[PDB]
Amino acid sequence: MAHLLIVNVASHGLILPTLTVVTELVRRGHRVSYVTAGGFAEPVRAAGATVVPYQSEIIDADAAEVFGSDDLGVRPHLMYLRENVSVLRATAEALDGDVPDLVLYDDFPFIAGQLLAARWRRPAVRLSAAFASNEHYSFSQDMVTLAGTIDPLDLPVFRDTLRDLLAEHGLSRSVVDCWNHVEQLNLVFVPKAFQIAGDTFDDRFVFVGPCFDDRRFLGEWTRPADDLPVVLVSLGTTFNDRPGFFRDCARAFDGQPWHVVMTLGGQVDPAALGDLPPNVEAHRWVPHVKVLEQATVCVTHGGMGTLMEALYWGRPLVVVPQSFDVQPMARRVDQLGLGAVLPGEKADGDTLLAAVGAVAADPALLARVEAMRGHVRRAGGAARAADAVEAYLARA
Amino acid sequence: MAHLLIVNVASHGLILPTLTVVTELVRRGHRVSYVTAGGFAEPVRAAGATVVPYQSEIIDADAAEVFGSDDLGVRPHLMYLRENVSVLRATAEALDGDVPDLVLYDDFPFIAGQLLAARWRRPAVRLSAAFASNEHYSFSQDMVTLAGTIDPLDLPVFRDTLRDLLAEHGLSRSVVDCWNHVEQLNLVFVPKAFQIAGDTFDDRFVFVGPCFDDRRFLGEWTRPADDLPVVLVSLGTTFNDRPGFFRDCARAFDGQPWHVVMTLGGQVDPAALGDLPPNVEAHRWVPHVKVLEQATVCVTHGGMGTLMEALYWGRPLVVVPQSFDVQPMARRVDQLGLGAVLPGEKADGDTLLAAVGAVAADPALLARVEAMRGHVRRAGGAARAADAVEAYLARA
Ligand SMILES: Cc1cn([C@H]2C[C@H](O)[C@@H](COP(=O)(O)OP(=O)(O)O)O2)c(=O)[nH]c1=O
Numbered sequence A, B: 001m002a003h004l005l006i007v008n009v010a011s012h013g014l015i016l017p018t019l020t021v022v023t024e025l026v027r028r029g030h031r032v033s034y035v036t037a038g039g040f041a042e043p044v045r046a047a048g049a050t051v052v053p054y055q056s057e058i059i060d061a062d063a064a065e066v067f068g069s070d071d072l073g074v075r076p077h078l079m080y081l082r083e084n085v086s087v088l089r090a091t092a093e094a095l096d097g098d099v100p101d102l103v104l105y106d107d108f109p110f111i112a113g114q115l116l117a118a119r120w121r122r123p124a125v126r127l128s129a130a131f132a133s134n135e136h137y138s139f140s141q142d143m144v145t146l147a148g149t150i151d152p153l154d155l156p157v158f159r160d161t162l163r164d165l166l167a168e169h170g171l172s173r174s175v176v177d178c179w180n181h182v183e184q185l186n187l188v189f190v191p192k193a194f195q196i197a198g199d200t201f202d203d204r205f206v207f208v209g210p211c212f213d214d215r216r217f218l219g220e221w222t223r224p225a226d227d228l229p230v231v232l233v234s235l236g237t238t239f240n241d242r243p244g245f246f247r248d249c250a251r252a253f254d255g256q257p258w259h260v261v262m263t264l265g266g267q268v269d270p271a272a273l274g275d276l277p278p279n280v281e282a283h284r285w286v287p288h289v290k291v292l293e294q295a296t297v298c299v300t301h302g303g304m305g306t307l308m309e310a311l312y313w314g315r316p317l318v319v320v321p322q323s324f325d326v327q328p329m330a331r332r333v334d335q336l337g338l339g340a341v342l343p344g345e346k347a348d349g350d351t352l353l354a355a356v357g358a359v360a361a362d363p364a365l366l367a368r369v370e371a372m373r374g375h376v377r378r379a380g381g382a383a384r385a386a387d388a389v390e391a392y393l394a395r396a
């Protein structure tokens, strides 16, 4: 009954929750256009969607290095607008003659998303792979706050670039109303129980939780031979250039009654770690969902995708936040008592060893992890998202 | 001519900026009721207002301890409501028979403010002694994020109490709408230029900047006989139980080309510092406003009052934040290049000494500070506040 456009940027965290949703909507006779770049085109086409390529900077940008350049975060902010503009121009060109009935856009390209919907006079849907935002809670604000950057709107060049962009595309919305625009429908990839201030989000928000595959394109992983409890250890895909962290982890678990699956996420080359104990392994990539299924503890920097996949299986958590983008999750896990949180420096090998053992042996924590798993399960998934999408089409 | 009620709580930072404003309205003939507790009654009467006492909990509470109690911040949050409720009941008791034409309330007692405005069906005005909040920026969220506490609306007992309070008081305004309510007029004691995301604030907000007196009731001060550049050092009135800080600073400035004036703020006894060099003073209280007039550098934790009082006199800053509450102001001062910031531990006497000398000798920084001084002067202060109120009073 529809041609659905998904507006997104080139990032694992933002695309992976989307895949099984695409496959479900397509299963129901809908047709999907998907904005993406580079190697992401491959899994996106496999989910059933037609790929609309665009030129991305962020795809091979070094996050740590970008946020390091200057002390106000001008470089991050301006790259943000560029990625949005690059996405806006490429989608319009491709689909100006094939107008979608429904524009769905991730938080990141939300400027391009609003402008596209306005340009075509089409209903819109927002997708959140992290925490959702409303009048009470802004995932964006405490992003700025924690990151230490300048407010984007306090940055004259950013503000003017945006004002000229809205003006050009004639969107009848002011810069501030645009930046703080709440969409009529929002698909969020966490349970409401986990969402910060989740009790405050109304009907416009649908908390469907993690949506995932076997994800064979991230490789495959098979239960070990030593039959030791399995600990997943990963720093994600973004701020993951930390051979020190991984090497110290391998050392601490050397001879310990655990089997460690280490995930480098594309930065550190396994070889750069040197030799690992027999109970410790390291990959550029393995499907977290595949390790976590057989796992006992999950050690993660706090990436949402990894947290929700771990909680899906009721795995006690050890969160090792190394960057700002992940701190709200880590704060939320700590306050829900879903695991131990070792922020930055504190996440050394030895401390990480005591934490892994501690949370694996805590009956009260395990009581909370099991219950939360229950909310994740009773959360929609790809099926409930597609339902919302189809009900939304109806009202339009 | 009117009866103006000022709803406030027993706190120096929240009451000081209000005083000269009261005196102006009264001077113009209006009659002012002022909600306060304890020893603040004296200065408030002086300003020319009629004191409405309420039983206060925060007036004799130790912030550091209160926030140290538990890991979620349940004790602070619940005290916050009690303070609000205690203020609600007292004022209602006193003014039910003497309804005000206008209800002016500070951010803190904003819940009691809204309910009183609704009860009596009167226009209301909000007062912000720190940054103001709107749809783009929330000082509150910034606070919770920085303090590491749970969102108050994620805390059942807190929201239930709030919900019931709103219901029992007839207010037809949901808990979340209530919490994120934007008043139709806001007096903000900050220049819009300093305000975070100032450009995003509309005409509902009037940035009148600092409003102060001789403040003789805080004692007096005559510049030294040694004729050294005077440096004001102060950790404020809230998280100021830090003898090590003042002790180490006095030690560092020993025999240095500066005259250090330290204010303990009713916490540490001056005697507990022990012997001080001839060029270092220590007081329970002296009017920052009088030191700052003769000063060369202001060293402060980031209290909004001290900051604005210093910028009023174009004084270079060394910001030494030791607590979440002054963290956004330290961030802002740093972004505007108005001074050096030495967060928490970084703030030893030796590093403080270099900073003081450094900010005093930076031509660029001084250009920026002198310019901000310009904005503070343009703000309009007490006169402009009464102007706004009177216009609001006539419109409604
Ligand atoms: C690094 C890595 C991530 N993932 C998945 C898990 C998450 O759903 C998603 C995003 O990674 P995540 O760890 O959440 O990191 P980031 O903070 O960078 O987004 O990618 C893997 O499956 N295998 C891997 O090796």
Ligand SMILES: Cc1cn([C@H]2C[C@H](O)[C@@H](COP(=O)(O)OP(=O)(O)O)O2)c(=O)[nH]c1=O
Residues within 6 Å of the ligand: B012, B013, B016, B215, B218, B234, B235, B236, B237, B238, B239, B263, B264, B265, B284, B285, B286, B287, B288, B289, B302, B303, B304, B305, B306, B307, B309, B326
């Ligand atoms: C401690 C102290 C404060 N003040 C004034 C300056 C401010 O306007 C007001 C509040 O103090 P401030 O320094 O801003 O601290 P806080 O963050 O704790 O509120 O008190 C004095 O005049 N003298 C003093 O000795």
